[PDB]
């Protein structure tokens, strides 16, 4: 709320005013009023009260107060509204400001974006936290220097980066749409005194750099203008904040490439270079004010003492015993046998026993973790359940082995997890101290004990050998076979011993590194030492395959180092944008705050504002989550301090979203027993207010920063039918050329549903579409915008001119007949094609991912005939547990309604040439994705720590392995797909 307790403050509100001479003055104010008028109203009345003579001029004083976030805040911007002040209580202390004003304003602007006050980081005792804050700044200032390598063109490349594809090479069906490899492009120019446009239709090669597009434009002294005024102008997309600034073939830009497939003409705009270059903020950077034995020398087995737990929340009636389960983990696999304490009564949780592990301390790998939990118990059939869990890194960030007594405040068990330990969960104590607290004791080895240096490791790796052959074709063929296994197909013990024996030949096939790493005995310093030397000189690999090495199965820092170095060399901003969700989530697996991946992502976010935008939002959406609060907050703090002017743009977005959260809250709690007619009236009455209009207008779309959101069309904004009360919002597109792209921007704001599952489903769909397109399959999907922006708060892009299947139907011919009206005449065939292609893609895509059952409301159709899906909700068949059967659903069944459309209204709708043509499209689509199975398995694997109940374990990702039939041959995989479609369509599949 805007005040504490009350969601909205009354029009009139009394304010307590604390004066510098120790006087309290009550003042009558307005909720809209500013701080300048309050201060002038105050000293007007302060003349009545005692000791006024001691008061100075108003220019010497400032207002201070406490906020909702428990922070004492000084209000420098005295043109702020009282409701926008974010006050805890209606009181204002007037004092004289001292210290650095500039950095105080900046600290509060970071704090506002970040979700928490920046001074909460100041009072963190933990050295790792303060080291991260200082050391990360080196990355930040080093990043702003790439933004000045060629100023002010560097500034333009940063703020408006080229939105390009990964490859200049075009697929066949894109090129075949071009007239002999040429594209008709319209360039518009303005004469602002006359304020009207003159269009110039051009016909140039697709692979023309903006300069060849800028040269031809002037024609529509012959070569003199293209010699001098060539690099004097820049191209812009109409109705967009998307610019062409770098030397790329025109067709490689996403918009132009999009225009070809859609059949639309590219509307570019001519604009002066200097006109945008001077409009750029040129944001500068300022440094903030916050700027012995070896492990292999210890002749002892590992042991840890479990002392006691403060309490567990358990009913003494129902549970017989409690105990502590413990494990030494490298990633998700135990390094030795789990060790339990002796069972004790629920009332008194006290053990005081040394647990002994079958591991010699020298053999502890660098990434070794302690995983523990307090478990409960209930012939003698007994159930074991986790009450709370916690993980500890056995080495700290400075390579130091843990020692002596320590206290570990535990975490609640995630919903749905039944596993007694949680090796995937984050490490470290729960920030919430009012929490079950396990007290433990590690051995103390008369020193600071440190993990060996790389040079020490290399010497041992040589020693291990001291204690010729060629690679046969037989061996060379098994190595290829092993490397073709997917990332979840466990290698056998024969295969492990084979790979290890041939570790020196494995370099010849670099993509086998994930398998060789699984063949390493991680509880043996001899083998890990030998692996390190091989990893150091290992050939770089394709980014999609390197990402495999970033999930929770590969915690070793050298391995992760390698993976990040592959991304540094080969990951293009295009694909980085496409995988950003996973690269952010994968930060949750990282042992420490400072690591190579976080340095990579932050650098990328600070040198490319499109990446920065989504980097901010992905991190911010999870700030409510206490497992990641500190990490992401610290990360966000760094970004916001170094991103420059974009912080002001992000602030407006956050300010808009908070006010939408405010409004939807009130609707869900205080207005639940009101009808939608009145609920809407409340919404309008509250939106019409000046503070809401100024907040919800003139900001950038968080779904797409290139889309400016101007004035609200408030008469057309509506609450949707659902109980969570989604807001169907409508903005004007304020661009002076918006009519050529879109005049108005519609977005659904949802507060109550977790939109992370949909966000992932739409990402996968986008990637699937990319696969099919490059392989010559024109199956057009519609992965609309969807962004999670907080705890069950999100944004969904609205597709214009789209209708649900029920809307069409409310007879099984009316869908086909409806599409006929909207596409009357000869243009009818382009619709049936698009529908069939859309249907195939979505039929195959939904089957693979096992999304929730489709119905008339789930499925939508556009005017042109494009079919797409909405509200995915659950994937990987989450309705299979809580149910019985272990079979694979076909979510999207083609009823006769859909079959008629494909068959163009034919009688035998399953026995036409169009239906079989459709079938082969589904067969091609299915096998195309199967061939890229590793990519999808990898992406999902990075998402296990995310907190999404639909993927908590590798057993959940096993679903796509079963739908893509990976344990089978390619022939059998196709046969499996056919049978699933036949069983779902009751035999109507004409096999």
């Amino acid at each position: 709320g805007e005040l504490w307790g009350i969601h909205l403050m009354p029009p009139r509100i009394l304010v307590e005013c604390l004066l510098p001479n120790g006087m309290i003055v009550t003042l009558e104010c307005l909720r809209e009023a500013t701080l300048i008028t309050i201060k002038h109203e105050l000293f007007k009345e302060a003349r009545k009260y005692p000791l006024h003579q001691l008061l100075q001029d108003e220019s010497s004083y400032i207002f201070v107060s406490v906020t909702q976030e428990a922070e004492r805040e000084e209000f420098f911007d005295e043109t702020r509204r009282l409701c926008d002040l974010r006050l805890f209580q209606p009181f204002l202390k007037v004092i004289e400001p001292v210290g650095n004003r500039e950095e105080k304003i900046l600290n509060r602007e970071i704090g506002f974006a970040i979700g928490m006050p920046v001074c909460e980081f100041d009072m963190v005792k933990d050295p790792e936290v303060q080291d991260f804050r200082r050391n990360i700044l080196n990355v930040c200032k080093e990043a702003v220097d790439l933004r000045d390598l060629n100023s002010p063109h560097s500034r333009a490349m940063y703020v408006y980066p080229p939105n390009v594809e990964s490859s200049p090479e075009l697929p066949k069906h894109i090129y075949n749409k071009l007239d002999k490899g040429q594209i008709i492009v319209v360039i518009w120019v303005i004469v602002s005194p006359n304020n009207d446009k003159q269009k110039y239709t051009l016909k140039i090669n697709h692979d023309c750099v903006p300069e060849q597009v800028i040269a031809e434009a002037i024609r529509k002294q012959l070569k003199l203008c293209v010699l001098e005024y060539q690099g004097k102008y820049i191209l812009k997309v109409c109705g967009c904040d998307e610019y062409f600034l770098e030397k790329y073939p025109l067709s490689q830009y996403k918009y132009i490439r999009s225009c070809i497939m859609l059949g639309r003409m590219p509307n570019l705009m001519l604009m002066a270079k200097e006109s945008l270059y001077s409009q750029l903020p040129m944001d500068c950077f300022t440094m903030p004010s916050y700027s012995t034995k070896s492990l292999w020398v210890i002749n002892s087995a590992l042991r840890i003492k479990i002392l006691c737990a403060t309490y567990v929340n358990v009913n003494i009636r129902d549970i017989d015993k409690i105990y502590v389960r413990t494990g030494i983990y490298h990633g998700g696999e135990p390094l030795c046998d789990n060790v339990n304490t002796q069972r004790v009564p629920c009332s008194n949780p006290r053990w005081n026993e040394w647990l002994n592990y079958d591991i010699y301390i020298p053999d502890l790998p660098r990434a070794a973790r302690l995983c523990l939990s307090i478990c409960s118990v209930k012939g003698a059939k007994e159930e074991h359940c986790p009450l709370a869990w916690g993980n500890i890194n056995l080495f700290d960030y400075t390579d130091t082995l843990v020692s002596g007594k320590m206290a570990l405040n535990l975490w609640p068990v995630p919903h749905g997890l039944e596993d007694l330990l949680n090796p995937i969960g984050v490490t470290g104590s729960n920030p919430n101290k009012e929490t079950p607290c396990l007290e433990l004791e590690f051995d103390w080895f008369s020193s600071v004990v440190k993990f060996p240096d790389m040079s020490v490791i290399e010497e041992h790796a040589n020693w291990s050998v001291s204690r010729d052959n060629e690679l046969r074709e037989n061996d060379k063929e098994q190595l290829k076979a092993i490397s073709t296994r997917d990332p979840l197909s466990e290698i056998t013990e024969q295969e492990k011993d084979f790979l290890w024996s041939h570790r020196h030949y494995c370099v010849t096939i670099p993509e086998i590194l994930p398998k060789l790493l699984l063949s390493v005995k991680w509880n043996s310093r001899d083998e890990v030492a030998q692996m390190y030397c091989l990893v150091k000189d290992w050939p770089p690999i394709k980014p999609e395959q390197a990402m495999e090495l970033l999930d929770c199965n590969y915690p070793d820092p050298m391995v992760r180092g390698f993976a990040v170095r592959c991304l540094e060399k080969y990951l293009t901003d295009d694909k980085l944008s496409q995988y950003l969700i996973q690269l952010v989530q994968v930060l949750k697996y990282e042992q420490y705050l400072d690591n190579l991946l976080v340095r990579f992502l932050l650098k990328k976010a600070l040198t490319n504002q499109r990446i920065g935008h989504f980097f901010f939002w992905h991190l911010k959406s999870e700030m409510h989550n206490k497992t990641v609060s500190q990490r992401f907050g610290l990360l966000l703090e760094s970004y916001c301090r170094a991103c420059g002017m974009y912080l002001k743009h992000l602030n407006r977005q956050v300010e808009a979203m908070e006010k939408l959260i405010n409004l939807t809250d009130i609707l869900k709690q205080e207005k639940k027993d009101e009808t939608q007619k009145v609920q809407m009236k409340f919404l309008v009455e509250q939106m019409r207010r000046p503070d809401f209009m100024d907040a919800l207008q003139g900001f950038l779309s968080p779904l797409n920063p290139a889309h400016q959101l101007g004035n609200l069309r408030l008469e057309e904004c509506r609450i949707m039918s659902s109980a969570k009360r989604p807001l169907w919002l409508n903005w004007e597109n304020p661009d002076i050329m918006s009519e050529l792209l879109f005049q108005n921007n519609e977005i659904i704001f949802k507060n109550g549903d977790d939109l992370r599952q949909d966000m992932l489903t739409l990402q996968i769909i986008r990637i699937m579409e990319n696969i099919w397109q490059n392989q010559g399959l024109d199956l057009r999907m519609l992965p609309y915008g969807c962004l999670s922006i907080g705890d069950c708060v999100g944004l969904i892009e609205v597709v214009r001119n789209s209708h649900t299947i029920m809307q069409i139907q409310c007879n099984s011919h009316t869908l086909h007949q409806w599409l006929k009206d909207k596409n009357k005449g000869e243009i009818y065939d382009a619709a049936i094609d698009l529908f069939t292609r859309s249907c195939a893609g979505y039929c195959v895509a939904t089957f693979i991912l096992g999304i929730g059952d489709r119905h008339n409301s789930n499925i939508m159709v556009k005017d042109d005939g494009q079919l797409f899906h909405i509200d995915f909700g659950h994937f990987l068949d989450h309705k299979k547990k809580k149910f019985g059967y272990k079979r694979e659903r076909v979510p999207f069944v083609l009823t006769q309604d859909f079959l008629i459309v494909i068959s163009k209204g034919a009688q035998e709708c399953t026995k036409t040439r169009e239906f079989e043509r459709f079938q082969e499209m589904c067969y091609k689509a299915y096998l195309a994705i199967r061939q890229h199975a590793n990519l999808f398995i990898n992406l999902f694997s990075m998402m296990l720590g995310s907190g999404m109940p639909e993927l908590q374990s590798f057993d959940d990702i096993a679903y796509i392995r079963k739908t893509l039939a990976l344990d089978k041959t390619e022939q059998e995989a196709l046969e499996y797909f056919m049978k699933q479609m036949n069983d779902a369509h009751h035999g109507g599949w004409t096999t």
């Binding site: 005692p50 009913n315 046998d337 013990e493 019985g884 059967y885 089978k968």
Partner: protein, 277 residues
């Protein structure tokens, strides 16, 4: 007796089950626990032995050539049953000295025969309906408790920060007493000798008002402290209730799954299973 049985009748033989099914039968089981499944069709080998060791699942391929089975060249066993029964008595150290254990505890496919000895299909099906209804019911009971839990956890968060915001307020209002004390020490002094009690009348009025305002604020956070203690207590109670449903949930799920297995291993129509569920 044992060596002459078919592989098909072997308790530890599961046939065409997936690697993920194998994992769910081997989770948190003692070392020596094992089962055999068919190898994946796209690979060399006929069967995969899977066993527990040091808390991990070990996969060993069983190969076949000319009537002989084994883990590697040469193949010396006459049948899979012969191979398995050999390593139920001999340590696997004979094959690989690093994995030193025996195949001790078979995951029997006649496992559910212990729990359900009911020979009638319909009686097993109807008990599947009863165990499923019980499970669904408790699942929804646990679900509501989780909604309560999270909401309670979120409201506690708001209160905790509100306590800190109250403390901050009290600090400011107490420092306001300090400022008025340091400012009036000489200004009351001047009019103590000048005898101006009329001014003192309105300075003390202001000071008493400040003291009066502090009282309310301290009392308000005192009230919030009580609310918080009450809600934290609710939290721990919700947590207790959830910890009682969890064990019952696992058992109710395990029983349903084993009753589903008995009907599957008897091949009951995929449609009649769904009318029970």
């Amino acid at each position: 007796m044992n060596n002459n049985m078919s592989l098909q009748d072997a308790e530890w033989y599961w046939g065409d089950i997936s690697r993920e099914e194998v994992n769910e039968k081997l989770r948190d089981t003692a070392d020596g626990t094992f089962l055999v499944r068919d190898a994946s069709t796209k690979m060399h080998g006929d069967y995969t032995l899977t066993l527990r060791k040091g808390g991990n699942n070990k996969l060993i391929k069983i190969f076949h050539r000319d009537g002989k089975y084994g883990f590697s060249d040469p193949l010396t066993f006459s049948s899979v049953v012969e191979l398995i029964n050999h390593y139920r008595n001999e340590s696997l150290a004979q094959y690989n000295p690093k994995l030193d254990v025996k195949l001790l505890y078979p995951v029997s496919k006649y496992q559910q025969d212990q729990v359900v000895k009911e020979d009638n299909i319909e009686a097993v099906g109807k008990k599947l309906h009863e165990y499923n209804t019980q499970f669904q019911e408790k699942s929804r009971e646990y679900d509501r408790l989780y909604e309560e839990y999270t909401r309670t956890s979120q409201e506690i968060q708001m209160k905790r920060t509100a306590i800190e915001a109250f403390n901050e307020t009290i600090k400011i209002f107490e420092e306001q007493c300090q400022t008025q004390e340091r400012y009036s020490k000489e200004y009351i002094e001047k009019f103590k000798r000048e005898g101006n009690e009329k001014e003192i009348q309105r300075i003390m009025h202001n000071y008493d008002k400040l003291k009066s305002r502090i009282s309310e604020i301290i009392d308000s956070r005192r009230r919030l402290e009580e609310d918080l203690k009450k809600q934290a207590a609710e939290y721990r109670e919700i947590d207790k209730r959830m910890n009682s449903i969890k064990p019952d949930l696992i058992q109710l799920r395990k029983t349903r799954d084993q009753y589903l297995m008995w009907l599957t291993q008897k091949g009951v129509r995929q449609k009649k299973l769904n009318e029970w569920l």
